[PDB]
Design a protein around this ligand. Structure first.
Ligand SMILES: Nc1ncnc2c1ncn2[C@@H]1O[C@H](COP(=O)(O)OP(=O)(O)OP(O)(O)=S)[C@@H](O)[C@H]1O
Ligand SMILES: Nc1ncnc2c1ncn2[C@@H]1O[C@H](COP(=O)(O)OP(=O)(O)OP(O)(O)=S)[C@@H](O)[C@H]1O
Ligand SMILES: Nc1ncnc2c1ncn2[C@@H]1O[C@H](COP(=O)(O)OP(=O)(O)O)[C@@H](O)[C@H]1O
Ligand SMILES: [Mg+2]
Ligand SMILES: [Mg+2]
Lengths: 353, 327, 292, 330, 100
């Protein structure tokens, strides 16, 4: 398997990147009967899902990693077979309602309500139990729920709290409505420091010999990962296999292709500011959108690449960030992203000229 | 049976003499009934003005005890699609009236929720069977009605209830419920009514429930404000004075103290300050433009939630910055 | 681990039905089965709490908490030789019910074709195979159904549920061969003509009266029984599923001494038996699906 | 046993704290039989659902509740067909006969209650199809609408429903209820705590109860027998430490775009919520006496715009950087 | 324009009696005509299937009272309203058709 999954902490004691967070998780798992609904939020790739699985392993014991995929089928108002994969475990369930689109309301209203209605009585056990009495449902990407699946959950996880518990993983919990955040215990997961990422990469290159020339090459990957442990571990494997398992100080850091294309677009915007350049930028944006890359991330990386240009004055950057905020708000409240993604670029070139 | 009913349903008018506020519409429909020729009617107005109470009392006056078999009342609670119009309404209009009261009456309550196909199909049922049936259309929004349907209907506008009508109905309610109301409490109730009798009755019922002893006790303005959770007329003036005269720390303290005194929300304070600043003699024409535009955005943001303290500070800053233009 | 046995259907016409009822009801219940070949009693076990390869998503996404615990005496088979180093020569296995049930259908049909040939079951050497062999009357049929050798520690985790008797009231269901048997079978399966019923509210009021209440329709339906019912030994009620009642319908149709055990809002136990003469008792433990 | 938010849910109407203007009115309807149509609106976690659940119990009893109550929430479909068929047929239903025990123990009003919780998520047509349903069968069926945004309820429906505003639960009206829960659970806290919890939880008792439960679960895990301090409460509530906020305002005061951008980039990695740092900056800037009237007037609108954009589900990094750049140029 | 004529024989039509709107004065040479929608008129078709005798009565108010007696047995009473007939040429065409 990939080094991101192979070297994954499978227990609460194997976590080694945040210790004030691991202690809070141990405090939560000490008495699992009264565990409230949890909402883990933080940057992407910090280890939020790994920590959720480690907490579930501390609560229900080993075996929560024995995952099987049970394909479900749903029908909306106008008869149409809509399919959702449900990765399930003998003690917990993982669902991604965002994968089915705007119709995640029917998934939340049927699957989650049917799970929350089954008491999970098992053999007797009608009094209580630390495990196997209540159930854990993991809702990955809680941010992409379309404000109606979040309304069907407010009473679902409140009335049926005795037989079900929810642990939802999310980043930047702004599009999560206030009633959902009120019913839940907010758990902040900070990103690992560069020293911690370097230590984890050192452990990886110790278990698998890649012949590290200098400890600085692991630090460069950590600084290029911007706090993303999964990305850092992916670039480690990339520069490992692309250099015959021998990392040198001159080894280039491999970055995603869409990031390079966004940087090229930024340089084109800085160099050429005209209508035809705007049309070429629209072609680049369409090509980027054809790869199912979300438009908010396109705008975010484009803005933070334009703010890194050394030939731009402070007045230009203060206008770029303002246009970025305005068009991000427009993109959030919109249907088609090309209009806003082109308007931001047009205003940027109209300001830089 | 009628004593276990909400006051908005217990005090529903049964005759045309109990409908107050709308004098020109009643004095016209009564003559229409007296001559016996009732045209196709259209009742338009704000909610809680007395359109349904008027049309049901009118039908009772025309038909007496035959209201059951002579009046077809279809509203938003029943399906009123193209098939319903083409079958139920058409066979009700086409069949005879057993020579009971001459013409039939079809009351289409909440016709603004009706689809355009049904309203277009009803045009040749309204003007074809008009000899034996008459249509009454009750609506609150005239933009959802087709222009032809508006053309084939005599439009009567139900104005918001005047203060005198509210006082006359409040007197009857107080006499029936053996309740006492101070003049200032009546003033507060009428200003909070906004031309709605249902709100008046709902607030009066809560005020009676609020009293420890329903008799020998008078409902004051304090009781009404406590029950409905509205700011007193002095709290709004104090907040506005603190914002307009005091500095940014004292105004922030005064707003928070006033709100925490009685758990006052920000939206009612915003509306009260808007109403107080409406009769202000501004002299710049930009103070009003900035005030209305900023307060409307704050009001819209409150409707979608957010941080309350930030919105209160935004109100204070908007007023302070808009009044910088005036001087 | 030496496990060998021979079954001949013609000599005893009751023990073959006893075994067929287990092999069919376990296959209908869930995938694969446990066969505990003790030195004197065979214990076919179907449980979601274990089974090793039948404990995937049992009481997780379908509410399958039903546990069947049957018992086959050693006198059923013709030769009962069990050799194992475990306690009382215990040999616990786990094989699928598909191949085993198909093989039993083939053997039963071979019998229906007019044959007297026996069947030989062996264990041809922790994963093994079952050497089922028989013939017509000299066509050869060999079926090496895969099987495993689930450990003694894993065996110990498989314990029969302990049913209390503080509030339990037994109900002696009438024999199917009797006059009231067909009527009672029809009353049992009467709840199956409504395709939108998922839960069944059993009720017994003490001459006991057995009542079935359905509250999942626009109307309130109560399926009652005015016939004679015996209580071997206050209203005790339990809400169970519909498939758990269908399997009980089949068990009642396949047996005579059937006891309906009802725990108040706790469980429902369907105790079947076959007094051959020790006794091949079939016990199904069903848990409440909802609260009263 | 259960989470403290579910263990301490008000069972009767006397356990609902800080909302007396509505509970006093509702208690009077127990002796009478003139309960009106009700519209419960207010901030989240104020006790709107618990109040109606306690009123329903006190009015009917657990046996008559199953027959005299229909509750529809956002977890089930409430379209035009559901409203025009299921709700209308339940309103048209006949009031069931109360039992002798029910009539001798509970008031048993001669009507049923239809509770439509989370009514703000219903469409304008499903709400329009409810007006005559409530009006025609008001003598046999009562309606209770629960919502957080009263603007999402149409004016015709709001006119027919008696409006009950649930006040935000602050440290002045929920401190006794929080102290009761602390005492029954034997939670040891320093002086000042249980007020910082209610200050962080702006108008929400559910979040404060969950915060206290989380603090206790760490307090008994440490095993030192020491009182819970406000620092731990702020740490596990997501509140940014004051040193980091002072660093933010010092970086803002310099006004250099690049250093503020780098600090925001290294701050977003710590996982802090934008709605919390913006709120803390609001308290820092508005209450400070080192800023003039013009600066406060401008920054009030800047913070309002940032909060409004953040509430719409936008990127926190971009909004926070733009806000700090705008303050740096004020 | 199709017509179904019930026989004047006393086994099918046992008794036909036309009055001048008072159910007492039997007159001859004048016919009563009732305009009905067959959607309402077909509602009695499932009741005439088990009917031994059917009694038809109509007044001047345009109400047809269909009386169906089955053989003891169930007694069925269906009352039906008559259309406006706003067009007054079909009446004369009915008269011409019956005279034809
Ligand atoms: N003029 C009036 N005189 C007395 N009571 C009135 C009057 N207008 C309204 N009411 C009261 O308000 C209640 C509601 O008014 P309705 O006439 O039923 O509805 P409406 O005024 O037509 O508004 P909409 O469009 O239906 S929401 C009535 O049942 C009365 O109790
Ligand atoms: N006045 C109060 N007294 C006691 N507990 C309260 C009070 N208000 C809220 N709570 C607690 O807050 C938690 C949730 O209350 P609910 O009423 O169910 O939520 P809510 O007010 O409906 O908010 P929603 O569902 O987001 S609209 C429970 O644990 C209640 O005990
Ligand atoms: N404490 C840790 N030690 C070693 N590796 C870790 C640790 N935390 C996270 N990782 C690595 O990070 C990778 C991705 O983390 P992930 O769970 O996807 O984070 P998030 O949930 O924030 O997306 C995992 O493959 C795991 O190997
Ligand atoms: Mg009306
Ligand atoms: Mg609620």
């Amino acid at each position: 398997s990939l080094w991101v999954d192979k070297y994954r902490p499978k227990s609460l004691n194997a976590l080694s990147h945040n210790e004030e967070l691991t202690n809070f998780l141990k405090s939560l798992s000490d008495q699992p009967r009264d565990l409230p609904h949890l909402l883990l939020y933080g940057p992407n790739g910090t280890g939020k899902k790994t920590r959720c699985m480690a907490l579930l392993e501390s609560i229900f014991g080993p075996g929560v990693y024995r995952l099987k995929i049970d394909v479900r089928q749903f029908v909306t108002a106008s008869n149409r077979k809509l399919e959702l994969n449900v990765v399930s475990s003998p003690y917990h369930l993982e669902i991604t309602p965002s994968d089915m689109g705007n119709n995640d309301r029917i998934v939340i209203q049927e699957l989650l309500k049917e799970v929350a209605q089954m008491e999970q009585v098992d053999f007797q056990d009608s009094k209580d139990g630390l495990a196997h009495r209540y159930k854990c449902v993991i809702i990955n990407e809680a941010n992409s729920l379309t404000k109606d699946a979040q309304a069907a959950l407010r009473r679902t996880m409140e009335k049926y709290s005795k037989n079900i518990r929810l642990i939802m993983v999310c980043d930047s919990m702004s599009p999560i409505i206030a009633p959902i955040k009120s019913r839940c215990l907010l758990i902040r997961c900070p990103a690992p420091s560069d020293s911690e990422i370097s230590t984890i990469l050192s452990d990886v290159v110790t278990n698998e010999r890649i012949q590290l020339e200098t400890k600085d090459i692991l630090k460069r990957i950590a600084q290029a990962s911007n706090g993303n442990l999964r990305v850092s571990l992916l670039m480690l494997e990339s520069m490992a296999l692309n250099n015959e398992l021998a990392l040198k100080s001159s080894s280039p850091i491999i970055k995603p292709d869409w990031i390079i294309v966004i940087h090229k677009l930024t340089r084109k915007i800085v160099k050429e500011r005209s209508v035809n350049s705007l049309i070429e930028c629209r072609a680049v944006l369409y090509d980027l959108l054809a790869h199912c890359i979300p438009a908010n991330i396109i705008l975010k990386e484009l803005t933070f690449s334009l703010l890194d240009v050394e030939t731009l004055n402070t007045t230009n950057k203060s206008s770029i960030i303002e246009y970025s905020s305005v068009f991000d708000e427009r993109l959030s409240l919109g249907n088609k992203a090309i209009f806003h993604l082109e308007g931001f670029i047009a205003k940027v070139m109209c300001c830089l000229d | 049976s009628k004593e276990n009913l909400p006051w908005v349903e217990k005090y529903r008018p049964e005759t045309l003499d109990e409908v107050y506020g709308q004098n020109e519409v009643i004095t016209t429909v009564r003559k229409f009934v007296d001559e016996g020729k009732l045209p196709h009617l259209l009742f338009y107005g704000p909610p809680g003005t007395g359109k349904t109470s008027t049309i049901v009392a009118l039908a009772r006056e025309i038909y007496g005890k035959n209201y059951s078999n002579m009046v077809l009342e279809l509203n938003a609670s029943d399906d009123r699609g193209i098939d319903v119009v083409r079958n139920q309404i058409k066979d009700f209009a086409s069949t005879r009236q057993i020579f009971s009261k001459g013409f039939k009456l079809i009351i289409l309550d909440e016709a603004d929720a009706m689809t355009n196909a049904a309203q277009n199909a009803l045009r040749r049922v309204i003007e074809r069977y008009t000899k034996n049936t008459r249509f009454c259309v009750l609506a609150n929004y005239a933009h959802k009605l087709t222009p032809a349907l508006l053309s084939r209907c005599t439009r009567f506008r139900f104005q918001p209830l005047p203060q005198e009508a509210i006082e006359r109905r409040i007197a009857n309610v107080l006499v029936h419920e053996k309740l006492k109301l101070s003049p200032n409490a009546e003033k507060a109730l009428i200003e909070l009514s906004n031309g709605d009798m249902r709100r008046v009755l709902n607030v009066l019922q809560s005020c009676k429930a609020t009293l420890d002893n329903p008799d020998e006790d008078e409902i004051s303005d304090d009781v009404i404000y406590e029950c409905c959770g509205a700011p007193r007329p002095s709290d709004l003036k104090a907040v506005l004075k603190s914002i307009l005269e005091d500095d940014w720390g004292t105004a922030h303290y005064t707003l928070n103290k006033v709100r925490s005194a009685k758990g006052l929300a920000l939206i009612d304070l915003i509306e009260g300050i808007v109403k107080i600043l409406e009769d202000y003699e501004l002299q710049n024409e930009e103070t009003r433009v900035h005030l209305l535009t900023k307060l409307a955005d704050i009001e819209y943001s409150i409707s979608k939630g957010g941080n309350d303290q930030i919105q209160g500070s935004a109100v204070i800053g908007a007023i302070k910055a808009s009044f910088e233009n005036e001087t | 681990m030496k496990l060998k046995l021979i079954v001949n259907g013609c000599e005893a016409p009751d023990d073959y039905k006893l075994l067929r009822t287990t092999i069919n009801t376990v296959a209908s219940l869930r995938k694969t089965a446990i066969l505990r070949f003790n030195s004197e009693r065979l214990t076919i076990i179907s449980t979601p709490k274990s089974s090793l390869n039948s404990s995937n998503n049992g009481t997780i996404l379908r509410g399958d908490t039903g546990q069947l615990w049957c018992t086959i005496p050693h006198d059923v088979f013709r030769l009962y030789t069990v050799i194992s180093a475990r306690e009382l020569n215990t040999i616990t296995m786990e094989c699928n019910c598909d191949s085993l049930l198909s093989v039993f259908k083939r053997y039963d049909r071979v019998m229906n074709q007019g044959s007297s040939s026996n069947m030989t079951i062996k264990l041809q050497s922790p994963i093994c195979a079952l050497g089922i062999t028989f013939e017509e009357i000299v066509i050869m049929h060999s079926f090496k159904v895969p099987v495993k050798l689930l450990f003694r520690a894993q065996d110990t985790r498989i314990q029969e549920p302990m049913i209390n008797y503080i509030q339990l009231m037994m109900y002696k269901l009438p024999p199917i061969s009797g006059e009231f048997g067909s009527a009672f079978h029809g009353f049992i399966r009467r709840v199956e003509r409504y395709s939108n019923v998922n839960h069944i509210h059993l009720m017994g009021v003490k001459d006991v009266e057995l009542k079935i209440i359905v509250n999942e329709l626009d109307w309130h339906l109560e399926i009652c029984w005015n016939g004679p019912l015996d209580s071997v030994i206050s209203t005790h009620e339990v809400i169970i599923r519909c498939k758990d009642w269908k399997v009980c319908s089949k068990l009642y149709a396949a047996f005579e001494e059937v006891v309906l055990a009802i725990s108040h809002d706790e469980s429902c136990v369907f105790h079947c038996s076959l007094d051959r003469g020790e006794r091949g008792q079939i016990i199904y433990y069903i848990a409440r699906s909802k609260g009263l | 046993q259960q989470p403290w938010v579910e263990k301490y849910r008000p069972k009767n109407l006397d356990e609902v704290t800080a909302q007396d203007h509505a509970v006093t009115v509702l208690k009077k309807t127990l002796k009478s039989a003139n309960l009106p149509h009700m519209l419960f609106y207010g901030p989240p976690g104020t006790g709107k659902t618990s109040t109606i659940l306690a009123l329903t119990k006190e009015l009917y009893g657990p046996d008559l509740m199953k027959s005299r109550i229909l509750e529809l929430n956002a977890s089930d479909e409430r379209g035009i067909s559901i409203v025009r068929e299921k709700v209308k047929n339940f309103a048209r239903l006949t009031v069931s006969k109360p039992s002798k025990h029910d009539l001798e123990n509970y008031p048993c009003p001669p009507y049923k209650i239809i509770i439509l919780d989370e009514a703000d998520s219903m469409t304008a047509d499903a709400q329009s199809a409810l007006r005559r349903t409530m009006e025609t069968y008001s003598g046999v069926t009562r309606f209770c609408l629960i919502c957080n945004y009263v603007t999402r309820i149409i004016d015709p429906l709001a006119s027919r429903c008696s409006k009950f505003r649930f006040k935000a639960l602050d440290a002045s009206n929920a401190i006794d209820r929080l102290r009761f829960i602390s005492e029954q659970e034997n939670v040891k806290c320093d002086d000042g705590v249980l007020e910082r919890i209610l200050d962080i939880s702006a108008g929400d008792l559910r979040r404060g109860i969950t915060l206290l439960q989380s603090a206790s679960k760490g307090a008994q895990y440490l095993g030192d027998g020491k009182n819970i301090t406000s620092t731990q409460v702020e740490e596990l509530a997501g509140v940014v430490p004051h040193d980091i906020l002072i660093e933010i305002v010092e970086k803002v005061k310099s006004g250099d775009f690049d250093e503020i951008k780098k600090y925001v980039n290294t701050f977003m990695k710590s996982g802090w919520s934008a709605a919390s740092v913006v709120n803390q900056l609001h308290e820092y800037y508005i209450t400070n006496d080192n800023f003039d009237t013009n600066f406060k007037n401008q920054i009030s609108w800047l913070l309002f715009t940032t909060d409004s954009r953040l509430n719409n589900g936008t990127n926190e990094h971009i909004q926070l950087l733009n806000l700090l750049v705008k303050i740096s140029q004020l | 324009f199709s017509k179904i004529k019930l026989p004047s024989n006393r086994s099918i039509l046992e008794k036909l009696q036309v009055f001048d709107g008072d159910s007492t004065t039997v007159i001859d040479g004048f016919a009563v005509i009732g305009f009905f929608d067959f959607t309402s008129f077909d509602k009695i078709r499932k009741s005439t299937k088990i009917a031994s005798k059917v009694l038809f009565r109509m007044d001047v108010h345009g109400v047809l009272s269909v009386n169906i007696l089955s053989q003891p047995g169930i007694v069925i009473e269906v009352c039906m309203l008559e259309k406006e007939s706003i067009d007054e040429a079909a009446q004369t065409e009915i008269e011409l058709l019956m005279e034809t």
